[PDB]
Design a protein around this ligand. Structure first.
Ligand SMILES: Nc1ncnc2c1ncn2[C@@H]1O[C@H](COP(=O)(O)OP(=O)(O)O)[C@@H](O)[C@H]1O
Ligand SMILES: [Mg+2]
Lengths: 54, 503, 54, 45
């Protein structure tokens, strides 16, 4: 409302309002948590055989 | 367009009226001997016909010395000089906040006109012994050195004296940038409206100053008042009285206000120019007599008001430079004599390595522990006494006079607290982190830890305490005193962090 | 009443407009007055820590 | 900046046109209003 009253350029304020308030971007992905958790499980298994040997 | 039309044709009254004038004799160098004004009152704003104000001083039976507010080309010999009818005055409001205002009231920053409401006379009389009450509130600056050795009181004046290029304006802007966290908070008693009167500086320094304050989001306490070098000598003369009148408006309404008088010696030298052009006899260093009376009015316009007079305070801190560190010059002796608090920078510690460069024992705050929080009072008195002991033992044992365990203890604790008091530019911290870090420095736990490693200790310690100890700092700053459970908890956290620091 | 453009302007009017507009072009870059871009999609890539044996 | 420089152009052309017209305007109602003003200040003085 404030930027529509200030900017007298017709079409531009509703254009930016539509292209900005309906703008969505996703979270940047990982593809590493699966590796970290699998390496966690592997070192836990090696730590468990170390456990039973101790 | 049409609104501009109607405001132009309705705003000016064009109400002509018979009015006292007088022709002009010698218009020398911004001074004008005016013949005729036989009913002008002393120190009055008067108006030259080209649209420019002047101030009538030095009323003599021949003529009146009006000293002009601006350029001198626009005045001839023989033109009229109309009496405005009142003493020179400054338009003050709370809509004047965050706007650079040229010394009278004229906001030269390109953001529209000032929405002022309360005009105020600028040469007012300061309050007496009954309307004043003593310093009570702890005016914090965010500087560890200031808030732990020379603390300021909301209700007080305290110099920033040094030599040129030492960090005095930077100390003033640390003091400004600290108080954002008290403005955006809850208590009105904490909130800050400050007035930075830049006297005689250059316009790009004020422009980059406004850049630093806008980038630090300072523009609701701040009121920047620039009387720069190209401005006339009465604009540089009259500018800190304008900032004082705005501070008096906030004070007498009951809001805690302050004024930083940056480069107050420029007011002294502009008033020297004015007196020597109005042909007053010169005194010492060609400064006239009443320069002390000038700064004495200007600096005794500030102390805490009575509880029946709103409760608003004023904090005057004027910045003054010496030349070659000569404290014995005329303007530094006068302005040390009027003020009580004074922060001394010698500069050899700036090139030696401590920042901000308070070289110290010359600096004193007469209100002392009354203007600290209870925690900082409980911690940092033994620090000041230890620094006194350290300075005198290093001064006589420069060469290794006698080194027992006590003298190496004194030099160890002194050097470690010296590297505690180092602090980067434009990074003020709150009072609770200062209590935490001077607790980690004075109460043991840092005495044998390799003095080059104190700065990384500072960084990792502040990261630790801001990481998982925010509610405990809330307990420290809201409870006032550092309680005994918080005392032993700070002991445990600094011990754990000493382990994690030797990890 | 003298509408239809700024009155009796002369060329230096538009020259001052062009210099002020040129400094204003300097204060953002070479973007467009409509249909704003969002970002360039970067990727945070933290390297996998490994160990031979614990 | 558009409205600023158009405002400056407008205000300077207004002042110049005022100089152009009123520099060549005499019809003695100026002097008549002025003697009426001296008469009004006489009645209130
Ligand atoms: N805490 C600090 N850390 C680092 N540098 C500082 C600090 N305080 C001041 N300075 C230095 O001080 C200089 C500014 O000095 P200034 O306050 O402008 O003195 P003056 O106003 O007398 O010229 C800057 O160059 C800055 O590097
Ligand atoms: Mg300075």
């Amino acid at each position: 409302a404030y930027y529509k009253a200030n900017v007298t350029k017709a079409g531009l304020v509703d254009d930016f309002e539509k292209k900005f308030n309906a703008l969505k971007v996703p979270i940047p992905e990982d593809k590493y948590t699966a590796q970290v958790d699998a390496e966690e499980k592997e070192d836990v298994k090696s730590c468990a055989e170390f456990l039973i040997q101790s | 367009v049409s609104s501009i039309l109607e405001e132009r044709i309705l705003g000016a009254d064009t109400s002509v009226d018979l009015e006292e004038t007088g022709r002009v004799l010698s218009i020398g160098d911004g001074i004008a001997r005016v013949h005729g004004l036989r009913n002008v009152q002393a120190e009055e704003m008067v108006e030259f016909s080209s649209g420019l104000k002047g101030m009538s001083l030095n009323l003599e039976p021949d003529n009146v010395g009006v000293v002009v507010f601006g350029n001198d080309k626009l005045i001839k010999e023989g033109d009229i000089v109309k009496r405005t009818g009142a003493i020179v005055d400054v338009p003050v409001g709370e809509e004047l906040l965050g706007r650079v205002v040229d010394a009278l009231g004229n906001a030269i920053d390109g953001k529209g006109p000032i929405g002022s409401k309360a005009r105020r006379r600028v040469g007012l009389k300061a309050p007496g012994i009954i309307p004043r009450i003593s310093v009570r509130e702890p005016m914090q600056t965010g500087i560890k050195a200031v808030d732990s050795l020379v603390p300021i009181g909301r209700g007080q004046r305290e110099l920033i004296i040094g030599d040129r290029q030492t960090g005095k304006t930077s100390i003033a802007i640390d003091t400004i940038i600290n108080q954002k966290r008290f403005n955006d908070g809850t208590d009105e008693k904490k909130k800050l409206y400050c007035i930075y009167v830049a006297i005689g500086q250059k316009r790009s320094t004020v422009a980059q100053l406004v850049k630093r304050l806008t980038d630090a989001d300072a523009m609701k306490y701040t009121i920047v008042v620039s009387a720069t070098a190209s401005d006339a000598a009465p604009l540089q003369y009259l500018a800190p009285y304008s900032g004082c009148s705005m501070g008096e408006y906030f004070r007498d309404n009951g809001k805690h206000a302050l004024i930083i008088y940056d480069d107050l010696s420029k007011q002294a030298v502009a008033y020297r120019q004015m007196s020597l052009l109005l042909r007053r006899p010169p005194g010492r260093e060609a400064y006239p007599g009443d320069v002390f009376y000038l700064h004495s009015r200007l600096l005794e316009r500030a102390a805490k008001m009575n509880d029946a007079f709103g409760g608003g305070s004023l904090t005057a801190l004027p910045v003054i430079e010496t030349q070659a560190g000569d404290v014995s010059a005329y303007i530094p002796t006068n302005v040390i004599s009027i003020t009580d608090g004074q922060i001394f920078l010698e500069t050899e510690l700036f090139y030696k390595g401590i920042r901000p460069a308070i070289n110290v024992g010359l600096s004193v705050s007469r209100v002392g522990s009354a203007a600290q929080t209870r925690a900082m009072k409980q911690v940092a008195g033994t620090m000041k006494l230890e620094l006194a002991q350290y300075r005198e033992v290093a001064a006589f044992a420069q060469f290794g006079s006698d080194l027992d365990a006590a003298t190496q203890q004194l030099l160890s604790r002194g050097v470690r607290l010296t590297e505690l008091l180092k602090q980067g530019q434009y990074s003020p911290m709150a009072i609770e982190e200062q209590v935490a870090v001077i607790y980690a420095g004075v109460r043991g736990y840092l005495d044998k830890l390799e003095p080059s490693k104190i700065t990384k200790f500072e960084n990792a310690f502040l990261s630790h305490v801001i990481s998982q100890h925010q509610t405990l700092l809330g307990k420290i700053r809201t409870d006032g005193k550092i309680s005994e459970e918080a005392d032993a908890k700070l002991k445990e956290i600094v011990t754990n962090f000493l382990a994690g620091f030797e990890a | 009443q003298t509408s239809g453009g700024p009155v009796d302007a002369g060329p230096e009017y538009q020259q001052d407009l062009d210099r002020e507009l040129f400094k204003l072009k300097q204060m953002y870059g070479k973007a467009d007055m409509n249909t704003f871009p969002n970002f360039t999609f970067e990727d945070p890539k933290f390297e996998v820590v490994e160990k031979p044996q614990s | 900046m558009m409205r600023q420089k158009e405002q400056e152009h407008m205000i300077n052309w207004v002042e110049k046109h005022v100089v152009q017209s009123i520099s060549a305007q005499q019809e003695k109602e100026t002097i008549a209003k002025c003697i009426a003003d001296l008469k009004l200040l006489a009645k209130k003085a």
